[PDB]
Amino acid sequence: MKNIIRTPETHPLTWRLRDDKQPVWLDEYRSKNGYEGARKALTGLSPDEIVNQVKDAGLKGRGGAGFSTGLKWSLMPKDESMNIRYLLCNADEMEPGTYKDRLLMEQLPHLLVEGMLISAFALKAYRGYIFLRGEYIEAAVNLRRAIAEATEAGLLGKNIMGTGFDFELFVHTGAGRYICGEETALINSLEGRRANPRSKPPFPATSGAWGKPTCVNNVETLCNVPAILANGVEWYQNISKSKDAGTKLMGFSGRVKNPGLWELPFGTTAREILEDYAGGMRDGLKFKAWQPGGAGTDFLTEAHLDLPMEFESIGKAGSRLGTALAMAVDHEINMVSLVRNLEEFFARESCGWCTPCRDGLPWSVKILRALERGEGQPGDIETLEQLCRFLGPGKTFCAHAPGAVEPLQSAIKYFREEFEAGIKQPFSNTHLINGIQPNLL
């Protein structure tokens, strides 16, 4: 609700935000407990114990999969001879409904710089690349200006803080493709290739960018670690009494009274987020459905509110938590138009590598256009069901396809009345030919 007592304890990432919404630079950042984490890390802690601390903390990736960060960081090789390692920060954020990292990169850039410095010291990476989206222009100016500001305080370059560690940071903007957010296709885009995904195994922990050990991490995953080191792991586990540790940037969007984004701990139920934080729907509209975590997530109903925002709690509820940024769909939006728009986006953003994505999704969108205009034929609904069945996990080359079909199968499963209300014409894909009698079924 409109007044919230933002404290360093319960809002570690976002308590540094000023009332005029302008970014906070290195002189102001170090006055309000800035970079002390990276001093204790570079001067006091070894990389291996830092990795063990991050594993004990139980930090999970905020990019939409929720894999453990310390185990992934422990997948890196144990061979000293392989001294060329890279740290890549997935700052693409092209999924519809995802605007969280824009706040962190526009207003708190030194948080990301410090977090990548700590993660690089843990992973022994000499070079770091921030994979920023190329549409975010003011994020790129503030990131590069704050990086050039941090180069004269001795936090980057050579002999940083007197230790032998050498870390050099770069910002390179993207060219505007959604599949660049997939981590192996992010590595391929960084190499200057068409951003096809790669087959796993091998993993980028062993063979990544330029065949070197690499670790792709979301922006918020890297921004969480300075809080861990500055305050402690013992503080970090006991933020929430829930199976997921730490805070998450959760928000609600659509035509609601107060659409926005607030940092909240895990286990917050939808009712307070929608009506206490977002202020509920606009007056004279009732609530029909909600997507919990962006466009790739399954649609949910009113019964699925009052339910905690966890990976395994939403997982057993028939959906995926994703980015945790929720979408409201009201009663005056036709669901067929929403699904047709979603499939248009997913179909048109396919990289084209694998057959069931390249060819299935255009068929699904054309069927949805036929249903929307009212020319749908009786075989259309079973074709959409077959498309969703055969586009599940493991059958396509990457995870863009299951994420494309999850809203389609959830919207057909819960709202089949509208989808089956546009089938007013029978099935005919053939024209009569004179002199040839047809085969009558």
Binding site: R177, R194, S199, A347, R348, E349, S350, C351, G352, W353, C354, T355, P356, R358, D359, G360, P362, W363, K366, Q377, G379, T383, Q386, F390, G394, K395, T396, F397, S428, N429
Partner: protein
């Protein structure tokens, strides 16, 4: 070296090999487009799907790709599993949604791998009623004719031309369902090994221009072993 269990039977295979060349070595017909013995497996076409179980007692497993799965000892697979057969037929159908009505006037007719895999899967009934995507062609020399409408996006041409042959003037362009295989601009393919594309491409996109002057189908040809 390794022992595998296929549809209940048991076979002896090389562990280093993947499952597609293992099952093809035993005479088990699995359809495929993107795999080639020389070029290797990339996993693009998704046509070689088989059902893999965790052990002999697992009744419900997962669909994997036999070109991308090693033929390790203890592997339990089913080529003829009903869900695998439905998926392979569906993949053929998705490739058939945009294919031109050209077999009478296609030089690959009677020698086309796509025709063989379509019959082998058993897909004979069209459900797609919408418009088809079309492409314009390019001129690729006096040797190779180009008909991009027939492309199935198997990526064999770029994998042969760039990786294997180290040619520089053939690539893939575009995105999603608009992928275009060819040159940046019209002009003769400069590589000394350009003509193997006629065997490498499983459809009639790249065809022999010297044969299309006096064309006849393969069943009418008389062959002898020569040097």
């Amino acid at each position: 070296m390794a022992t595998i269990h296929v549809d209940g039977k048991e076979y002896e295979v090389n562990g280093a090999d993947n499952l597609l060349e293992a099952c093809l070595s035993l005479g088990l017909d699995i359809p495929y487009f993107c795999w080639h013995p020389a070029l290797g497996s990339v996993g693009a076409c998704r046509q070689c799907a088989v059902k893999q179980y965790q052990n002999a007692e697992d009744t419900r497993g997962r669909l994997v790709m036999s070109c991308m799965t090693p033929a390790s000892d203890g592997t339990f697979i089913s080529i003829d599993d009903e869900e695998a057969k439905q998926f392979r037929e569906s993949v053929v159908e998705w490739l058939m949604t945009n294919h031109p009505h050209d077999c009478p006037v296609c030089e690959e007719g009677g020698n086309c791998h796509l025709q063989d895999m379509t019959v082998m899967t058993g897909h004979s009934f069209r459900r797609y009623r919408f418009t088809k995507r079309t492409h314009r062609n390019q001129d690729l020399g006096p040797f190779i004719s180009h008909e991009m409408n027939r492309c199935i996006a198997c990526y064999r041409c770029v994998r042969y031309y760039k990786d294997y042959a180290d040619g520089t003037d053939l690539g893939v362009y575009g995105a999603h369902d608009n992928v275009y295989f060819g040159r940046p601009e019209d002009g003769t393919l400069e590589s000394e090994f350009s003509g193997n594309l006629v065997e490498i491409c499983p459809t009639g996109v790249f065809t022999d221009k010297t044969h299309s002057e006096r064309y006849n189908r393969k069943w009418d040809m008389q062959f002898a072993p020569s040097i």
